[PDB]
Structures are given as C-alpha cells and as structure tokens.
Amino acid sequence: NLKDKILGVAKELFIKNGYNATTTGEIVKLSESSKGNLYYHFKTKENLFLEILNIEESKWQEQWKKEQIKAKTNREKFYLYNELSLTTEYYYPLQNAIIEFYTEYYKTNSNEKMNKLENKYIDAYHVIFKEGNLNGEWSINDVNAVSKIAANAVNGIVTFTHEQNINERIKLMNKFSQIFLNGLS
Amino acid sequence: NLKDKILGVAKELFIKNGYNATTTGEIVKLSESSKGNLYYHFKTKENLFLEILNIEESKWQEQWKKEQIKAKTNREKFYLYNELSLTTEYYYPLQNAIIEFYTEYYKTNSINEKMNKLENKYIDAYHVIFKEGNLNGEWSINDVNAVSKIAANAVNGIVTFTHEQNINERIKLMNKFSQIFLNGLS
C-alpha cells in the first residue's frame, strides 16, 4: 500500500527520532514518494502525526479489549491494563514524540485532537472505574477525575522509566496499581 | 567564573533558541571565552547542557529546602512538593530545551546514564519525605526506594501529560492524586 506505507515510515521515524527530528522530506526519502501524496488525506505534518496517534491509540485499545478478558475483576483489569501498558508496541512508544509535539504546536486551533484523543486514552480507566462502581469493588464519586489521574500517573511510570530492566518496571507498576486502588476504597 | 559565564550565557541561549539551534560558537563568543576553554570544561554541547541541568537541580533542591518549611508534617510536604513540581514547570523556561534534549538523547547510554543520576536527585526528595514519614508514624513503608520512584514518575506524568487543561483543574487533580496515593499507604 502507499498511504499505509508512509504512515509506516512516519510512525517508525517519530519513534526512533522525535517529532521535529523527522520532517516531511525525510519521510518521502524512505517512504519513497513525493509532495502531492501529502495533500488530500495528509494535509500538514501535524496532520500525518495526529493521524498515527489515532491509529496507534485504536490498535492499543483494541488489543486491550482482546486481552482484558484474562482479568476477572475490575480490580484485576486495572492492574493488567497498567502492566500491559508497559509492553504493548502500541501508542505508548510515541509518548516522547507526543510531548515534543504538544509543546511546539499547542498554539494552532486544531488542541482539539489532544482533547479528543484524550477521551479514548482515559476511557479504558473510565469504564474500569465505572464498572467497578457497579460491582461494589469500590465507590468513586469523581470517576472522570480519577480516570485522568490514573491515565497520566501510569503514562508517567511507563515513559520516565523507559531506561531500565523491564521486570523492575513491571514490579513498580504493580506496586503503583496496588497503592492507587487501595487509596480509592 | 569564565566557566560560570559560559554556563550562564549558554543557559539563556538554550532558553531563547532551544537546544538544537544553540551552537558552541555562539556560546563561545557571547561568553567571551573560546572553543578550547569550552572543550576543556565540558567537552561537548550535550555535556555542557547536562551541567546546566545539574546546576538547576541544585537550585531546585536549595529552593525546596526553604519552601518545605511551610509544611509541618511529611504528609503535607508530599502535597506541597507535588504541587510545586506542577506549578513551577508551567512557567519553567528551560523546560522546552530539556524536552528537545531529553527526547533526542534517550537513545544514547552515555547521556541517558547521567540523566538518571540527575532524576535520582529529584527522586531523593520523595525518599526523604517517606523515610521521615516512617520515623513519625505518618505511615509505614517498607519499600521506600520503590515508592519514591513511583511517586516521582507518577507525579511527572500528571505534570507532563495534563498540559491540556486550565491550571486550576491541573492543581485540583494533582492534589487529588496526592490524596489517593497517601491514602493507599496506611
């Protein structure tokens, strides 16, 4: 494919290098195409990016729903999601690029995705926490808040520890999950 | 002092133009030093930059030392510290140069290694709070080192990935996290 040949390079480059690091040109080189390509479906550079964030985010959320079955209680689903977050090949491997990007385009008026993609990012925690209320596993009045806090705290543990033994990572994340859930009841 | 003049001039350049755009040439001339002297003190731009970060870290700790008096109990020092981490970065000028740098060197072990010794300094703050909290029955934590890494990285996640909301909400959420976390320790 071609449109899905560029994305494959954009993704790989945004991961290896940074957002700025890789530019419209660099893509075309390895992606092997021209300028026009990036016009109809691929408007601006930030467009080709927000696109990938959409894909990747969906791939992850999909993989989660296919694997969330191994977790019988929502308390287990919480633990699992956070753990899985450390090993997926999806979405999380772009957080560094997201930061860079967000701090270099939070000017344009299209912080619309960053607040549209955010809902999908914290939705898994929304469902997990909401369902937990239906199962009496816990009682949280401010779900939306907790969801946001959890998603970001976790994203932090995954992103700012990406420089050490992965079993150490998985250990921490679990001690985290424990402490969090424990502070909820 | 010529070393200090470089660190100072370089800090501003990085702040005004970012890491990548800033060159050792500019730094050399504006600090009225030389390529040779710059090499002898820091060898590289990356190293020069890590030194800046080191100075800053030191200043942050010095600021904390003073600021933490407003918090009598460790429980409070926890709430306060996390709040400071979020509010101060909201307007930290070097922040942009750190990002550019960090997300461009998290692939080299040489640099990523020194950046860990650096964050460790940041994490020590939590380590102290928790240990002192133990020796006061504010809580009981057998895995202080662990909790400290967790607190620090979770707080950082809230600070970094929340940027898309008004500051009072951010503060509110942070304070909410500090509550949940502190509650899950008793």
Curated annotation (Swiss-Prot), chain A:
DNA-binding region(s) in UniProt: 23-42
Superkingdom of source: Bacteria
SUPFAM superfamilies: Homeodomain-like (SSF46689), Tetracyclin repressor-like, C-terminal domain (SSF48498)
An example Gene Ontology biological process: negative regulation of DNA-templated transcription
Domain HTH tetR-type: 1-60
Record keywords, A-Z: DNA-binding, Plasmid, Repressor, Transcription, Transcription regulation
Official protein name in the record: HTH-type transcriptional regulator QacR
PROSITE patterns noted in UniProt: HTH_TETR_1, HTH_TETR_2
Record note on quaternary structure: Homodimer. Binds cooperatively to DNA as a pair of dimers.
Swiss-Prot record, chain B:
Domain HTH tetR-type: from-to ranges: 1-60
Gene Ontology terms describing biological process: negative regulation of DNA-templated transcription
Keywords, sorted A to Z: DNA-binding, Plasmid, Repressor, Transcription, Transcription regulation
Keyword Repressor: yes
Gene Ontology molecular function terms on file: DNA binding; DNA-binding transcription factor activity
PROSITE patterns documented for this protein: HTH_TETR_1, HTH_TETR_2
Domain of life: Bacteria
Listed Pfam families: TetR_C_5 (PF08360), TetR_N (PF00440)
SUPFAM superfamilies linked: Homeodomain-like, Tetracyclin repressor-like, C-terminal domain
DNA-binding span(s): 23-42
Subunit structure: Homodimer. Binds cooperatively to DNA as a pair of dimers.
Functional summary from the UniProt entry: Transcriptional repressor of qacA. Binds to IR1, an unusually long 28 bp operator, which is located downstream from the qacA promoter and overlaps its transcription start site. QacR is induced from its IR1 site by binding to one of many structurally dissimilar cationic lipophilic compounds, which are also substrates of QacA.
Protein name listed in UniProt: HTH-type transcriptional regulator QacR
Organism: Staphylococcus aureus
Name of the gene this protein is made from: qacR
